[PDB]
Amino acid sequence: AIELHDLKPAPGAHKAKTRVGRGEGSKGKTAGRGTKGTGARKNVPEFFAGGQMPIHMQAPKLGGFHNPFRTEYQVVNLDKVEALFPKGGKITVDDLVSVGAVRDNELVKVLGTGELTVKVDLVVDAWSKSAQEKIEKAGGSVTK
Amino acid sequence: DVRPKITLACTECKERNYITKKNRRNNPDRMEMAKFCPRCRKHTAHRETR
Amino acid sequence: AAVCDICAKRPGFGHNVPWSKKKTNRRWSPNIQRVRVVENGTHKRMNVCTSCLKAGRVSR
Amino acid sequence: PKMKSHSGTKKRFKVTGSGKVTARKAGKRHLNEHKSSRVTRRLTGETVLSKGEAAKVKKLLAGHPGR
RNA sequence: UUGAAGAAUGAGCCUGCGAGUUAGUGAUGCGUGGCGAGGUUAACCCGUGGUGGGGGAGUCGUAGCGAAAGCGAGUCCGAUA
RNA sequence: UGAAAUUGCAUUACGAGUAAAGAUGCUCGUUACGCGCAGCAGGACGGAAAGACCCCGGGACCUUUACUAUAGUUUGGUAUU
Numbered sequence: 342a343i344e345l346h347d348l349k350p351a352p353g354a355h356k357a358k359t360r361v362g363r364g365e366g367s368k369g370k371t372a373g374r375g376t377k378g379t380g381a382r383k384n385v386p387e388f389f390a391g392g393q394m395p396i397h398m399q400a401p402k403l404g405g406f407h408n409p410f411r412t413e414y415q416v417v418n419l420d421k422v423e424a425l426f427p428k429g430g431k432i433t434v435d436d437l438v439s440v441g442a443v444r445d446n447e448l449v450k451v452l453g454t455g456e457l458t459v460k461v462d463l464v465v466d467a468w469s470k471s472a473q474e475k476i477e478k479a480g481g482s483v484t485k
Numbered sequence: 486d487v488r489p490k491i492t493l494a495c496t497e498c499k500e501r502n503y504i505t506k507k508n509r510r511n512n513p514d515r516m517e518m519a520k521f522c523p524r525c526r527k528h529t530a531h532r533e534t535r
Numbered sequence: 536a537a538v539c540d541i542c543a544k545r546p547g548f549g550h551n552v553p554w555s556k557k558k559t560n561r562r563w564s565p566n567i568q569r570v571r572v573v574e575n576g577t578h579k580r581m582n583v584c585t586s587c588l589k590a591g592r593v594s595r
Numbered sequence: 596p597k598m599k600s601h602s603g604t605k606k607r608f609k610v611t612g613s614g615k616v617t618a619r620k621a622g623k624r625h626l627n628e629h630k631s632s633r634v635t636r637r638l639t640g641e642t643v644l645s646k647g648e649a650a651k652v653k654k655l656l657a658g659h660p661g662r
Numbered sequence: 663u664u665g666a667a668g669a670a671u672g673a674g675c676c677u678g679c680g681a682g683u684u685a686g687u688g689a690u691g692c693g694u695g696g697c698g699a700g701g702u703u704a705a706c707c708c709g710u711g712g713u714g715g716g717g718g719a720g721u722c723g724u725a726g727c728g729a730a731a732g733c734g735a736g737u738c739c740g741a742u743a
Numbered sequence: 744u745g746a747a748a749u750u751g752c753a754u755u756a757c758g759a760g761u762a763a764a765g766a767u768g769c770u771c772g773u774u775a776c777g778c779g780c781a782g783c784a785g786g787a788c789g790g791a792a793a794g795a796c797c798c799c800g801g802g803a804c805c806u807u808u809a810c811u812a813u814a815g816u817u818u819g820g821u822a823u824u
């Protein structure tokens with residue numbers, strides 16, 4: 342039984358639009374720009390530094406290259422594996438880590454910051470050495 | 486022009502390890518020095534490149 | 536002339552490109568030659584490009 | 596329309612995991628003979644920008660994460 | 663404008679008109695609302711009945727470090743320093 | 744019969760001062776009843792033209808053994824041969 346005339350926004354949700362150049366009791370006349378100069382009329386570009394050689398020219402170019410065929414490993418940690426499979430996840434898989442969170446349709450590398458008190462069989466794409474060591478120490482395994 | 490830049494390369498692994506300056510008129514010939522060669526991992530004789 | 540009466544080869548337009556790369560408009564005309572032809576039985580001149588003349592597409 | 600990122604900024608500046616802006620030290624490309632090994636060591640690192648310069652670089656990168 | 667009642671500028675007078683706008687699934691803050699380790703759809707399809715429903719392709723968050731191979735709570739320079 | 748440029752205003756003195764350094768308008772004094780008509784040009788830094796000199800920014804055109812180009816003229820190759 343609200344009725345359309347009882348709908349009001351939350352306080353502070355609709356800030357009033359500041360209207361500039363409408364009198365000297367507000368941002369009036371110069372409209373918050375001061376007097377004379379470039380800034381009195383347009384702007385100054387962010388790459389411009391006054392004629393001094395700008396930072397983006399004086400700094401040397403980071404060289405190197407990009408791997409055209411670089412693949413990025415979605416990474417899951419042993420903390421997360423333990424938390425999302427606490428009941429001793431017998432055989433975790435890519436689909437299971439995806440329904441938890443791994444951002445699927447990618448390679449699903451597992452890393453090893455954590456403890457992993459449970460036994461787990463990961464079956465993922467690649468793993469770190471410390472993660473593998475912790476997994477067999479707990480009694481689990483990795484595959485693929 | 487009278488004190489050129491000379492490059493010392495190790496006489497073992499022919500690696501241009503160092504660069505320095507001589508006098509050309511006070512030392513006309515190629516200079517011999519014992520410097521540390523990182524590749525050879527010891528002190529090897531270094532000779533000015535030709 | 537710069538248009539072939541056979542194959543209608545016509546000038547192309549591009550750039551003079553100096554060392555400083557100050558590009559200026561220029562033209563590439565086809566190598567048009569005016570030769571005597573005997574077509575069917577008609578003696579007449581025709582402006583014929585050297586490509587057509589070499590290919591033999593023109594009867595002399 | 597989408598805002599393009601500054602090309603020189605893309606090629607020259609990195610953004611770390613914690614939002615720091617870093618560049619490569621300047622002055623080591625050539626004329627290195629007269630420079631001591633100490634000077635070359637000072638110039639061979641990676642410098643962290645000041646707050647104002649980092650803000651300017653972040654504005655120049657149109658959300659580009661740096662090189 | 664350092665400084666103007668100024669013998670510096672503009673206005674004869676009234677009435678009307680006359681300048682911070684709008685567009686981006688732009689960039690970056692803040693307020694506020696929703697959901698929350700998740701958030702969100704674009705085109706398009708359906709609703710000839712709209713403002714509603716579908717659509718998760720993508721995209722941001724979910725790990726960083728390195729020129730990169732790569733390694734990974736570490737990584738890179740380095741001598742497994 | 745009937746305009747014009749001009750016009751922040753008005754109940755618009757002088758003297759010696761003072762002040763953006765040359766005041767009808769501020770100070771201290773002096774003089775002056777209200778309103779007209781014909782006149783004269785010392786002042787209102789009088790009106791008319793966003794100084795035409797100077798400098799600073801921009802432009803234009805002109806010049807040349809400034810730069811970079813180019814039509815034209817010329818050299819050779821090659822096609823037509």
Ligand SMILES: CON(C)Cc1ccc(O)c2c1C[C@H]1C[C@H]3[C@H](N(C)C)C(O)=C(C(N)=O)C(=O)[C@@]3(O)C(O)=C1C2=O
Nearest residue numbers: 748790791792793794795796797798801802803804805
């Ligand atoms: C001998 O030195 N005395 C003091 C000057 C002077 C004397 C007698 C004159 O007769 C004129 C001048 C000045 C010039 C100024 C010229 C100028 N122009 C050439 C760019 C200009 O700017 C305008 C204008 N319309 O603004 C002109 O009137 C103008 O052309 C012209 O005619 C002038 C004259 O008549």
Ligand SMILES: [Mg+2]
Nearest residue numbers: 365369370371
């Ligand atoms: Mg004001």
Ligand SMILES: [Mg+2]
Nearest residue numbers: 364365369370
């Ligand atoms: Mg005003």
Ligand SMILES: [Mg+2]
Nearest residue numbers: 372373374375
């Ligand atoms: Mg302001």
Ligand SMILES: [Mg+2]
Nearest residue numbers: 375376377381
């Ligand atoms: Mg202003």
Ligand SMILES: [Mg+2]
Nearest residue numbers: 371375376377
């Ligand atoms: Mg102004």
Ligand SMILES: [Mg+2]
Nearest residue numbers: 375376377378
């Ligand atoms: Mg100023």
Ligand SMILES: [Mg+2]
Nearest residue numbers: 375377378380
């Ligand atoms: Mg200003």
Ligand SMILES: [Mg+2]
Nearest residue numbers: 380385386387
């Ligand atoms: Mg600014």
Ligand SMILES: [Mg+2]
Nearest residue numbers: 385386387388
């Ligand atoms: Mg721009």
Ligand SMILES: [Mg+2]
Nearest residue numbers: 391392393394
């Ligand atoms: Mg300069």
Ligand SMILES: [Mg+2]
Nearest residue numbers: 557558559560
């Ligand atoms: Mg052009």
Ligand SMILES: [Mg+2]
Nearest residue numbers: 585588589822
């Ligand atoms: Mg031939």
Ligand SMILES: [Mg+2]
Nearest residue numbers: 404623624625
């Ligand atoms: Mg180099």
Ligand SMILES: [Mg+2]
Nearest residue numbers: 627631632635
């Ligand atoms: Mg050195």
Ligand SMILES: [Mg+2]
Nearest residue numbers: 663664665763
């Ligand atoms: Mg002044």
